[PDB]
Symmetry: C2
């Protein structure tokens, strides 16, 4: 009852879907997506990575008749993240890791998604650049 | 020389692109993308959020002739993340925040993007569910 590890449900490749029985109830897979190598004449390997996960949580009560009176609520969420780029990606990733977490952390603390809008004081900061 | 804050270049709406002069020199445009309501008969507000980023860092020094001579390299990265879902999203996000960080943190520590492939020991864990 501490960690919430997920397990696959029939799959064997670079695109395997994972899910839990009663942990998160989520289900999805994550694979790499190499493409869009714009601006890259000089020899430079191309790296990328895509990960998507869905979260579903329907009402507890059972089903019934949906005609006169029926109330069967359900939750539906989806998260998609993709990152691609030349070899330099391995470097931008480390910086983007703490940057994508801070930029989104400050946007939720200053802005409000409940209205699909943000404030003019969107002061976002990045991890770093060098020492 | 501590924080790397970003600023807009020219915009005024829910979709504005920010960047820095020398800090990161990368363009980032955030915008709310509401869609795909899916199973959601019961009254439940719809929330979402999409964020796009574009990293660019070309080799130093000026340009020259690109025919019988050698050209300078250039780095190019891109990060796209989007999340949508009913009101439950507000709660799911909190959990997905630490989950998307650990799931991706363990995938990079166990797997290798350099080969666009991962290992069979992809033991990913989620934040939590309840107490």
């Amino acid at each position: 009852m501490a960690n919430k590890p997920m397990q696959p449900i029939t799959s064997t490749a670079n695109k395997i879907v994972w899910s839990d029985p009663t942990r998160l109830s989520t289900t999805f897979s994550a694979s790499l997506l190499r493409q869009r190598v714009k601006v890259g004449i000089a020899e430079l390997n191309n790296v990328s990575g895509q990960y998507v996960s869905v979260y579903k949580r329907p009402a507890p009560k059972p089903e019934g008749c949906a005609d006169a009176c029926v109330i069967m609520p359900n939750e539906n969420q989806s998260i998609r993240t993709v990152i691609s780029g030349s070899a330099e990606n391995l470097a931008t990733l480390k910086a983007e890791w703490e940057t994508h977490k801070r930029n989104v952390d400050t946007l939720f603390a200053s802005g409000n998604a409940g209205l699909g809008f943000l404030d003019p004081t969107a002061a976002i900061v990045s991890s770093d650049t060098t020492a």
